[PDB]
Write a protein that binds this DNA or RNA. Structure first.
Ligand SMILES: [Mg+2]
Ligand SMILES: [Mg+2]
Ligand SMILES: [Mg+2]
Ligand SMILES: [Mg+2]
Ligand SMILES: [Mg+2]
Ligand SMILES: [Mg+2]
Ligand SMILES: [Mg+2]
Ligand SMILES: [Mg+2]
Ligand SMILES: [Mg+2]
Ligand SMILES: [Mg+2]
Ligand SMILES: [Mg+2]
Ligand SMILES: [Mg+2]
Ligand SMILES: [Mg+2]
Ligand SMILES: [Mg+2]
Ligand SMILES: [Mg+2]
Ligand SMILES: [Mg+2]
Ligand SMILES: [Mg+2]
Ligand SMILES: [Mg+2]
Ligand SMILES: [Mg+2]
Ligand SMILES: [Mg+2]
Ligand SMILES: [Mg+2]
Ligand SMILES: [Mg+2]
Ligand SMILES: [Mg+2]
Ligand SMILES: [Mg+2]
Ligand SMILES: [Mg+2]
Ligand SMILES: [Mg+2]
Ligand SMILES: [Mg+2]
Ligand SMILES: [Mg+2]
Ligand SMILES: [Mg+2]
Ligand SMILES: [Mg+2]
Ligand SMILES: [Mg+2]
Ligand SMILES: [Mg+2]
Ligand SMILES: [Mg+2]
Lengths: 260, 188, 125, 155
RNA sequence: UAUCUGGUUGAUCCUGCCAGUAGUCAUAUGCUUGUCUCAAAGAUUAAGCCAUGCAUGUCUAAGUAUAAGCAAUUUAUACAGUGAAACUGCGAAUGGCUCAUUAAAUCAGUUAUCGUUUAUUUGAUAGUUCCUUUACUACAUGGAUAUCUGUGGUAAUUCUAGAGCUAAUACAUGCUUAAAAUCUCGACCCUUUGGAAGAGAUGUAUUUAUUAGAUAAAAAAUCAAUGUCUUCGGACUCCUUGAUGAUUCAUAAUAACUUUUCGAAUCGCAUGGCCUUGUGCUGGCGAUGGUUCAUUCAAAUUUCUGCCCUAUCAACUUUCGAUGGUAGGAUAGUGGCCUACCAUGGUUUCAACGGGUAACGGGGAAUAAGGGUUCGAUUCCGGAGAGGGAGCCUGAGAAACGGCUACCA
RNA sequence: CGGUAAUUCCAGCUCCAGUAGCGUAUAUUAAAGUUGUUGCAGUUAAAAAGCUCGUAGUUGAACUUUGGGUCUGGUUGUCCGG
RNA sequence: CAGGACUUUUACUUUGAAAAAAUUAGAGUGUUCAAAGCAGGCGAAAGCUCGAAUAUAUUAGCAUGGAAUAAUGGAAUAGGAC
RNA sequence: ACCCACUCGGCACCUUACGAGAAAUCAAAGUCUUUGGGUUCUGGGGGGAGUAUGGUCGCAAGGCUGAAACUUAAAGGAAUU
RNA sequence: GCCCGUCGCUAGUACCGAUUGAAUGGCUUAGUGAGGCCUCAGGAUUUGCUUAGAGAAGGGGGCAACUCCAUCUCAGAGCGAAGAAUCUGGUCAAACUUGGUCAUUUAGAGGAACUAAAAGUCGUAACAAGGUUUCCGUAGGUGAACCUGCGGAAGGAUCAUUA
């Protein structure tokens, strides 16, 4: 009905916002940005509901204004700016750097990171095409277009963007026996190896993934994000190395590592 | 206004559908331009998402392509002789797409002369040399040649003049041209 | 248009109102544990029933099957914590045999009475 | 379907932007454009060699096969260049723990590269809307001859 | 959490109902009513009618202040502190409400856009505007118009006439700009192995052509064109090409076209670096803008499958498009969406079509052995509508009603 | 039930039930194996078409690689807690 | 693996992928209890730290394992297979 | 043609039910709470009523199809003294 | 004992129905048709360019085509560009006049019902062989149960007459 929608009801929000059912009718709708609405994570949520540096929206706004938050080197001032997967959130005071990565369960984890890694962003390849004047460009599944790419970078390949300038420093080819991260579905937040790649030339390629504990699962190709060569990831993965325990196992862990 | 909705239609079964929702602006369709010949007059229309289509009510000139030779020239359109959809259009002189029209042809003739030097109906040294290098390539379909003699070439419009404002096409060649001629003859 | 608040009816009335023996039993129970209403008793019964439903379901699933192993175990643990099940009977099969008295003999009422501090249940209440 | 003639109506029917230069004379004399649809399907020799036209052919025209690929038996050939496909299936009624036999007719477009009789089983591919009801285009006709080899009983 | 009990008889066993019993985010209502927490609430009938008030406006160092505003005081003799108004920009298409319509419609899950539009967003990105090249706006072009000041009209309204000034990121115009490479033309010489001095054109967007957008492997003979090195027998060697399941795709190239789109005459704070010692040439961080391609928020359609009663609805659709074809028109684009010519189809006892709904669809709710039955106006998601019907303006987006135009009430 | 001993009316006293709640009305679900797929009935209680043919529908005899052997992974009971 | 070359076609069943959140079932957690909520918990009580799980929905589409059951197809003018 | 013995198909009948059933009774009315061989039709308390109405078929009588309002605590079945 | 129908009485439901009845809505024949949008014109007015002659007191840096200046500025007139009212055809199409039609309602002179209340009237049809055994189909007849043909059924008062 008539043009774009501008609000978001609290229940209609992505569940991995971890937003509480009460204390409001509305949720912070991610503005038009680099990442998809449902796959994003607004700055407000990151600030208030994760790190707890702000108490309310006004506080968040104030924080933003003094030009201190930095999403991928660039500044940002939107409360509802949609930082998503692999995005580096740097705070100038505190000197903390964060990379937005998922965890074993599904939601965005607070993952503290060093300045040596915070310099670069890792990004999947969505499209490879020749643009105007015959100039080749690559499209990252995370927002960007990069002109004149290395011509053996194809779709689904992951790319090390140096972020400070925005040039491709290095890349990983999508292939069997390469460390992978799942970014959508039930298996989202899981880390694996790629055992096999089914095709079905028509609709949705399925990739078979084994983790470190020899525990195979299948996801769609567009949910699968390459991260390195097995055992050696290009980024630091969060605590619990994207592993997925069974519920009982988790409970046991909780019990046996008690230290109140 | 004229709407392109499939709401007002009957279903596959022949069932008359009930009137759900009043007609929308995204369903809309505007009046026919039905362009005439003589003195250039082009009205812009604001479409969806900004953008302009150009209604070409009254057009005189047009640039037409000789696909064999590989050249196109701006030329006067003088009359619609045949239109596949409707004889009414022909009667009117309504310039549309796929209509068959008569072109001034003089520019084409001039071009030909410049190129080969052979002329249709009956200097420097470099030019002569060039001509020599060419030749025998200058033969053409007989029908075209005949037309040239009269001074008016048959061409088909391939632009949608109601959409672009631009009125453009291709000079009639080969089998298609022959077919068109036959059709014309039949009509007479 | 704010997110709806969840209610839950926490008791269930009997399916037959004047079952005389049942009524007398209820009365006796009330007398024993200084209960203001039959409502309290009903609440307890409802609670018991919920537990039973869970337990039965668990039983219906194969033993050593994950869900049974987990949820059932958790339930058992909870029961032991509350003090309704005894350490002899961490079994899930024993969960079905519980009966209303064990819940009433665990209220801050009865407990208060049974540690001194009172002289009868009413006083404690 | 076409059925004879080719150059049969008010307008000259040609493949758009296919040019057959009437100066340097070729082997085919008129150039024919075709493409393979993909998905493992094969472009027939009737399509490549033929003289017919069609914008709505998946091989020689402008439509592109994408999305759903269905199969079913042919019910009606009667309307020109198109077909009707019956598509029998079982609808599960959960209360009675049993199945209803159901129907649904799919109107589909028939490229003149095919010989289609009533009763032939046909593989049909989804494409861009073609008419009021048609969304589908015939890709493969499975009933090849029936019993056109030995029709007469005499050994 | 698998339960029944009273009533047909003089008594009996049944069939059968009626009556009881229990629940209802199920309404009403009758009596009562101390406390704590939680909290539905003009849906049902009349999508009946509406007094009065409010519900959408908005300004930052950073578009435009000569308020004849306030300042007032130790950046102004161009401005420079705040700042009403007004212009410009943006928003008012979200939200909120309601369920009247609506039964293959909506809607749900599922596809598709190789079938399109998309403000904003985040990435991208444009030496080519010139047009002959011995004296030219670019150290910056033009005319308006608001507020304001004054003169009024009317019983009246968020009615605006007349005059006088005055702004722009409003509205119009319109400059720089190389080097190279490539494509159109040849003052001549010297009888071939021919080969060139120098002159014009080339951005993008637009339009129609046309061409390229290759790729299953190796080895020839020679006939027409006839190149390059000749160590004058002759060799010929290293000879481009992205993506998809798939394209006439991406993209490039030649042809021209065009009542020639865009290519910064815009703002704030910084006041840094070389002296050819000019006030010269320079240079930092930003705002707004602007091209196409991205992307993001979206968008129209779209695939397959699924709706409640009814045969006291069995044939329905096709003059006035029904089903299909062809061409055009129209549209953001696909399509009988519409028009012309043609064909006679399309749906149906596996209920078409018609009728009803005290029908918005779904998530769900009540009940609660298992299976079911009934409900879902209503907090979330879709969809409709703003008394009824039309029709449109502005805009990225509305067939908008706290926009306009009409008719009916 | 009530026509002169009314345990049924109207009151008084006792008592029972639920209890800050309880009653009445109309729906609706369970009770209903009184809608039946699970799961009902049809000689006499309601109900077998007067009878046969018959398109759709539903349904429809049996029959094609069974048997052995050879190693080889597990997964719980056991045989001790090594 | 990466490419042909064509594969009788189903129904059924399997595991997987999808069936928004709330609701439902359910793990954790002394809202003083509870309905709830997604909180909290532990310190030197200088800072540290678990959390915010899981499971369901079978109609339709998609993916794969199975080949009993039920159907369909092939060589009888052989124009059949190598 | 009888007579005996066996055998398929038929109209029935007699005695027992170990099965059914409310019972009368039933070799099916059995192989049904130990509930599923395949199928078509019909019933859902008694009246109103095989009525009203609309179809349709009949020359007509009529047939097939077939309600509701309202009404009512029983109408019935088999057996008993 | 039980018990059936006619005619009575009192209520209450529904049914048919003369009324050329009434009302509302949905389609619709013929004819009209607001308003926008598009389009053919129209051209109030609004300006720009022509060197188109001025009075102007350096109307371009000293009598003079000003050592003539977007000079003083109107008759020009030609050439544009913008453009309101109005206007020709369309197109979408609310609506309106007279009819017709379907649906649902609604007055309704009269008529024919059924139920309820079952101390009215006439019989006694059925239940016993109910005093003519009951039923059923059908046809005729009657004051009313009903009676009487023709065919059938025991739910009959008969499971019965060998040879
Ligand atoms: Mg695809
Ligand atoms: Mg655009
Ligand atoms: Mg039950
Ligand atoms: Mg009786
Ligand atoms: Mg009695
Ligand atoms: Mg009851
Ligand atoms: Mg207090
Ligand atoms: Mg209301
Ligand atoms: Mg404004
Ligand atoms: Mg809204
Ligand atoms: Mg080509
Ligand atoms: Mg292209
Ligand atoms: Mg077309
Ligand atoms: Mg409704
Ligand atoms: Mg509903
Ligand atoms: Mg609803
Ligand atoms: Mg309603
Ligand atoms: Mg209103
Ligand atoms: Mg409106
Ligand atoms: Mg309002
Ligand atoms: Mg509104
Ligand atoms: Mg007394
Ligand atoms: Mg019930
Ligand atoms: Mg029964
Ligand atoms: Mg009977
Ligand atoms: Mg069989
Ligand atoms: Mg719960
Ligand atoms: Mg009855
Ligand atoms: Mg009897
Ligand atoms: Mg008009
Ligand atoms: Mg008698
Ligand atoms: Mg008698
Ligand atoms: Mg009887």
């Amino acid at each position: 009905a008539r043009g774009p929608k501008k609000h978001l009801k609290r229940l209609a929000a992505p569940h991995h916002w971890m937003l509480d059912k009460l204390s409001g009718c509305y949720a912070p709708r991610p503005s038009a940005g680099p990442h998809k609405l449902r796959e994003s994570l607004p700055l407000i949520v990151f600030l208030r509901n994760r790190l707890k540096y702000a108490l309310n929206g006004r506080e968040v706004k104030a924080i933003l204004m003094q030009r201190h938050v930095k999403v991928d080197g660039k500044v940002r001032t939107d409360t509802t700016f949609p930082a998503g997967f692999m995005d580096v959130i740097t705070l100038e005071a505190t000197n903390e750097n964060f990379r937005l990565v998922y965890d074993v369960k599904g939601r965005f984890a607070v993952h503290r990171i060093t300045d040596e890694e915070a310099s670069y962003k890792l990004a999947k390849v969505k499209k490879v095409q020749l643009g105007k004047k015959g100039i080749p460009y690559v499209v990252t599944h995370d927002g960007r277009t990069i002109r004149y790419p290395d011509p053996n970078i194809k779709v689904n390949d992951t790319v090390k963007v140096d972020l400070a300038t925005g040039t491709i420093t290095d890349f990983i080819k999508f292939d069997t026996g390469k460390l992978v991260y799942v970014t959508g579905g039930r298996n989202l937040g899981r880390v694996g190896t790629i055992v096999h790649r089914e095709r079905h030339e028509g609709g949705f390629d399925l990739v078979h993934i084994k983790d470190s504990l020899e525990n195979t699962f299948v996801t769609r190709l567009n949910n699968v994000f390459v991260i390195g060569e097995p055992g050696r990831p290009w980024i630091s993965l969060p605590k619990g190395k994207g592993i997925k325990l069974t519920i009982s196992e988790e409970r046991d862990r909780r019990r046996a590592q008690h230290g109140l | 206004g004229i709407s392109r909705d499939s709401r007002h239609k009957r279903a596959a079964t022949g069932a008359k559908r009930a009137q759900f929702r009043k007609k929308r602006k995204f369903e809309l369709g505007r009046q026919a331009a039905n362009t005439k010949i003589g003195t250039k007059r082009i009205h812009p229309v604001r479409t969806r998402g900004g953008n302009q289509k150009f209604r070409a009510l009254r057009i005189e000139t047009g640039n037409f392509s000789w696909a064999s030779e590989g050249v196109a020239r701006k030329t006067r359109i003088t009359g619609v002789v045949y239109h596949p959809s409707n004889n009414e259009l022909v009667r009117t002189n309504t310039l549309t797409k796929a209509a068959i029209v008569q072109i001034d042809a003089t520019p084409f003739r001039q071009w030909y002369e410049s190129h080969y030097g052979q002329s249709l109906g009956k200097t420097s040294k470099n030019t002569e040399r060039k001509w020599a290098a060419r030749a025998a390539e200058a033969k053409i379909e007989h029908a075209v040649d005949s037309q040239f003699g009269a001074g008016r070439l048959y061409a088909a419009i391939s632009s949608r003049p109601g959409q672009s404002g631009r009125c453009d096409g291709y000079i009639l060649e080969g089998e298609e041209l022959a077919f068109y001629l036959r059709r014309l003859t039949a009509k007479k | 248009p704010r997110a709806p608040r969840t209610y839950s009816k926490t008791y269930s009335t009997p399916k037959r109102p004047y079952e005389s023996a049942r009524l007398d039993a209820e009365l006796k129970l009330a007398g024993e544990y200084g209960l203001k209403n039959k409502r309290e008793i009903y609440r307890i019964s409802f609670q018991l029933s919920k537990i039973r439903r869970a337990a039965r379901d668990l039983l219906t699933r194969d033993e050593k099957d994950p869900k049974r192993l987990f949820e059932g175990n958790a339930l058992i643990r909870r029961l032991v914590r509350i003090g309704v099940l005894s350490e002899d009977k961490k079994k899930l099969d024993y969960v079905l045999a519980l009966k209303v008295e064990d819940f009433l003999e665990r209220r801050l009422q009865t407990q208060v009475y049974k540690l001194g501090l009172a002289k009868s249940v009413h006083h404690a209440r | 379907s076409t059925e004879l003639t080719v150059q049969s109506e008010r307008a000259f029917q040609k493949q758009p932007h296919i040019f057959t230069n009437p100066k340097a004379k070729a082997n085919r004399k008129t150039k024919r454009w075709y493409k393979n649809v993909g998905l493992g399907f094969k472009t027939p020799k009737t399509a490549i060699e033929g003289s017919y036209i069609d914008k709505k052919c998946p091989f020689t025209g402008l439509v592109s096969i994408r999305g759903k690929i269905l199969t079913g038996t042919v019910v009606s050939t009667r309307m020109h260049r198109t077909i009707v496909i019956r598509r029998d299936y079982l609808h599960y009624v959960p209360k009675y723990n049993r199945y209803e036999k159901r129907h649904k007719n799919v109107p589909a477009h028939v490229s003149p590269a095919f010989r289609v009789q009533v009763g032939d089983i046909v593989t049909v591919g989804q494409c861009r809307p073609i008419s009021k009801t048609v969304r589908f285009n015939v890709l493969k006709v499975a009933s090849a001859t029936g019993k056109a080899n030995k029709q007469f009983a005499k050994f």
